[PDB]
């Protein structure tokens, strides 16, 4: 009946927001990663790290506002407030991109907090911890994209900046530079994400159109009871429908719901792997057999060769402004350009 | 060829900056999340019907009258992971929610493609920010625009004889 | 010495076969191009 | 095309070996009942 058991008691009380031992890591960090983002997007510039404006105060809207990455000159510096780069000057810290690492690190520990939360609430309630497990897929995406990728690269400057349009810029970076659409790990991720949305809508509509008539009213929602032991739709009629429309259909309610867990969690895990390769510029950029034919045979053209021209346009036209620290200067006469445009 | 199509669409319509494509993403990320959430939550509350040496899936028999998970227990967990009232206790609202969210979002992204067919394009904030002298102060939108330009000037490199690609 | 009591049988049903084959065949068809390069 | 010659042995083994595995376990599942 000691102080630990007393504190456990108080943390684990049933209240509007459960707290738990995990709340101690989660809540400070989740609140700080979120305050960091709102703070920087409202007041903080990207002028000295990027040559960009990025706050409401500067005139950007919600689509263009962002907490941007530090200058490439910072390497992978932790940029601690109290560290050698900002030397405790909160103003200089902000201007060097110190809020990027703040958000990304407290965010990273908040995500751990949250997965432990799912572990803690599942143990205290007596369910199996498959929600926690499913959340491993968000974590792997986060760590691979925001941490591992720029760690393989020259600096944090090349991670995603935290902002709507800024993430758009990152999608186009990966097309032009990594040819990421060609990469069989992104494609499996794509199949996973869309596979999931498909499973989401198809399972929701099937339940809603094989409902049992359990009440008299035209609004069929009123006639479910959370404690009823009776299935609220006919698995049997739903099976016959999909068998006859599609050829196969589910017969097992457990396999169905496990498959709904499996598909999206797996696709995200596959894409994470693909980004890890990209950390090292280990791309699926080219087909060698294509390049040898095309070099030798100037009448040979495919959609593969077409898209690498488009990548070539992207790299040359965006590099100087998107990487100011390289002082690129491409005189007009060297920019790749099709006829007239 | 799919990838060729989606690159060229961005150079010509700024589809990423278009709200209807943003809702399609919201529909399609949200769908995958709710697919995993619903699948993990039902899977978390299976009632014990098997031993350690067998697929729990054998705990359900096709056409059984009883439900095969405890939704009260699932509500009880997800309610506490967030708060009680952000979680469903009625299965009909829950499954209609799963249906509606990705369907609606994909109506919009399909409408986005349908309406960018008449060249009502995504938001353009190229040079929207300037200083007191009148210098351009770039944002991330202008960076996007540079990438977009590199696409514009290269696509169908031989097929344009005049300065504007008007279709 | 007694025969080992920890042995169990293994099962793969027919749906799981179809699912497995589909998975391998689609995987083969996605990667085949990269193997040929 | 000037393509990777192990591509063929690679694809065949990629396909065959997991498949034979699944089949072996299926057929002996049916032989029980």
């Amino acid at each position: 009946r000691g102080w630990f058991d007393i504190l456990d008691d108080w943390l684990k009380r049933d209240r509007f927001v459960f707290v738990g031992w995990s709340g101690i890591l989660l809540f400070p960090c989740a609140y700080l990663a979120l305050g960091g983002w709102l703070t920087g997007t409202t007041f903080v510039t990207s002028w000295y790290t990027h040559g960009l404006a990025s706050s409401y105060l500067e005139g950007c809207n919600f689509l263009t506002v962002a907490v941007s990455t530090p200058a490439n000159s910072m390497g992978h510096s932790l940029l601690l407030l109290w560290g050698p780069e900002a030397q405790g000057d909160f103003t200089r810290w902000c201007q060097l991109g110190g809020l990027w690492t703040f958000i990304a690190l407290h965010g990273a520990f908040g995500l751990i907090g949250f997965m432990l939360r799912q572990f803690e609430i599942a143990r205290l309630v007596g369910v199996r911890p498959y929600n926690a497990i499913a959340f491993s897929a968000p974590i792997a995406v986060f760590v691979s994209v925001f941490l591992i990728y720029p760690l393989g690269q020259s600096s944090w400057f090349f991670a995603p900046s935290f902002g709507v349009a800024a993430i758009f810029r990152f999608l186009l970076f990966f097309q032009g530079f990594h040819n990421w659409t060609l990469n069989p790990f992104h494609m499996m991720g794509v199949a996973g994400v869309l596979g999931g949305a498909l499973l989401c809508a198809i399972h929701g509509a099937t339940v809603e159109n094989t409902l049992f008539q359990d009440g008299e009213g035209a609004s069929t929602f009123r006639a479910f009871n959370p404690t009823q032991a009776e299935e609220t739709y006919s698995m049997v009629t739903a099976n016959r429908f999909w068998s006859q429309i599609f050829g196969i259909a589910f017969s097992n309610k457990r396999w169905l719901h496990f498959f709904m867990l499996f598909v999206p969690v797996t696709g995200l895990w596959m894409s994470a792997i693909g980004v890890v390769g990209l950390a090292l510029n280990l791309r699926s950029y080219d087909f060698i057999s294509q390049e040898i034919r095309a070099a030798e045979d100037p009448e040979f053209e495919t959609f593969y060769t077409k898209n690498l021209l488009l990548n070539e346009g992207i790299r040359a036209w965006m590099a100087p402004q998107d990487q100011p620290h390289e002082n690129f200067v491409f005189p007009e006469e060297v920019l790749p350009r099709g006829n007239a445009l | 060829g799919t990838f060729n199509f989606m690159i060229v669409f961005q150079a010509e319509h700024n589809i990423l900056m278009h709200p209807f494509h943003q809702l399609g993403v919201a529909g399609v990320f949200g769908g995958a999340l709710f697919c995993a959430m619903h699948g993990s939550l039902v899977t978390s509350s299976l009632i014990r019907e098997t031993t350690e040496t067998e697929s729990a899936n054998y705990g359900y028999k096709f056409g059984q009258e009883e439900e095969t998970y405890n939704i009260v227990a699932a509500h009880g967990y997800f309610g506490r992971l967030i708060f009680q009232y952000a979680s469903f206790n009625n299965s009909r609202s829950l499954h209609f929610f799963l249906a509606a969210w990705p369907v609606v979002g994909v109506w919009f992204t399909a409408l986005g493609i349908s309406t960018m067919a008449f060249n009502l394009n995504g938001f353009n904030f190229n040079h929207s920010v300037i200083d007191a002298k009148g210098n351009v102060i770039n944002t991330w939108a202008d960076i996007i625009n540079r990438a977009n330009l590199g696409m514009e000037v290269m696509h169908e490199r031989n097929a344009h004889n005049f300065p504007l690609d008007l279709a | 010495m007694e025969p080992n009591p920890n042995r169990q049988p293994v099962e793969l049903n027919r749906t799981s076969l179809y699912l497995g084959l589909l998975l391998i065949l689609v995987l083969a068809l996605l990667f085949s191009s990269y193997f040929f390069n | 095309m000037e393509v990777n010659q192990l591509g063929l042995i690679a694809t065949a083994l990629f396909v065959l070996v997991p498949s034979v595995f699944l089949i072996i376990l299926y057929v002996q599942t049916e032989s029980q009942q």
């Binding site: - | - | 049903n13 083969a28 068809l29 | -």
Partner: peptide
């Protein structure tokens, strides 16, 4: 031989389709 390999896999998937539908284990009630 690349062409042949691609078509053989595709062909096999179509035949698996065939067995998965007409030669499924049939679902049976209660």
């Amino acid at each position: 031989m690349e062409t042949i390999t691609y078509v053989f896999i595709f062909a096999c998937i179509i035949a698996l389709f065939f067995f998965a539908i007409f030669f499924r284990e049939p679902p049976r009630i209660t």
